[PDB]
Amino acid sequence: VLSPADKTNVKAAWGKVGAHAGEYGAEALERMFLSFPTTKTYFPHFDLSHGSAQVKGHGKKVADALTNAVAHVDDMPNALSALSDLHAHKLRVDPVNFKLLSHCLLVTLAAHLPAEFTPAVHASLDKFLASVSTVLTSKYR
C-alpha cells in the first residue's frame, strides 16, 4: 500500500514531468524495446523505429494514463478500470513485461530529473508503478 509519503513523493516527481509527457513516455517505450526486445512481440503492427509517430502517440497515451493514476492515487483501481479491461481481454500482455516497462520509466525519470529522483522518490515511484501494473493485470483470470 502506498504510504502518505508515497503519494506526495510521486505527485511531486510526476508533476516535474510536466508537458514532457509524450516525450518521456515515448523514450520509456523505446528504452524498453531496445533493452528487452521480447516486449516487441506485442507491437508487431507498430513502426518501432526511432521517433516514429506510433510510439510518440502511444507514449503520450501511457504518460497520460500515469498522470491520471497520480491524480487518482487514492483510488487507482477505479480510474484504471477501463484500461485493466483492455490489457486483460484484448492485448493479453504477459504480466512480466509490466515490470520491464516500469523499470524503463524509472530510468527515463532518472535521466531527466537529476534533482527530483532522490532515493526516497525513487522508492516511491517504483512502488507506484508496481501498483499500476498490479491493477492493469487484475482481470487476467
Partner: protein, 146 residues
C-alpha cells in the same frame, strides 16, 4: 544446458514411457486454461471459452503433439538445444510474435502434466532434472528473438 549423467539418465528413461499423443495436448491445453491470455495465439483453433472446450478440442491435441514432438528432439540434443530450436525461435518471433515468456509457462505446465501422468514415479530429483530441460528449451527458443 548442464545435465549430469544421472540427470540425462533420469530424463531419457521417464520420457520413453510418455504417451506421445496425450501428454502434448494436455500440456498445451492446460496452458490455455491456466493462463488464458495465451489463448490469443490460438484463436484459429475455435472454441476455447472453457476447460472442456479447450481440452477436448482436436486442434489442441493435434498441435500439442507437434509441440511434444519438438520437445523430444530436445531430450536427445541437450548439448546443443539452440541449433535444434533455432529455426523455431525465428518462426515464433518473426512470424508468430509470441512472447517467449510463454515458453516458460508451458515448460512448467508440462512438469505438472508429467507429474500427473507419472504420479509417485515423478520424484523430486526427476522433477529437478526436468526443470533444467524445460528451462533449456524455452531458453533455446527465445535465443533468436530480437
Amino acid at each position: 544446458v548442464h545435465l549430469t549423467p544421472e540427470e540425462k539418465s533420469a530424463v531419457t528413461a521417464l520420457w520413453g514411457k510418455v504417451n506421445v499423443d496425450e501428454v502434448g495436448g494436455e500440456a498445451l491445453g492446460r496452458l490455455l486454461v491456466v493462463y488464458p491470455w495465451t489463448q490469443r495465439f490460438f484463436e484459429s483453433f475455435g472454441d476455447l471459452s472453457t476447460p472442456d472446450a479447450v481440452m477436448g478440442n482436436p486442434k489442441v491435441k493435434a498441435h500439442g503433439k507437434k509441440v511434444l514432438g519438438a520437445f523430444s528432439d530436445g531430450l536427445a540434443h541437450l548439448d546443443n538445444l539452440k541449433g535444434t530450436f533455432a529455426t523455431l525461435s525465428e518462426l515464433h518471433c518473426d512470424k508468430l510474435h509470441v512472447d517467449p515468456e510463454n515458453f516458460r509457462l508451458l515448460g512448467n505446465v508440462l512438469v505438472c502434466v508429467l507429474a500427473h501422468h507419472f504420479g509417485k514415479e515423478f520424484t523430486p530429483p526427476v522433477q529437478a532434472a526436468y526443470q533444467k530441460v524445460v528451462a533449456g528449451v524455452a531458453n533455446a527458443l527465445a535465443h533468436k528473438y530480437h
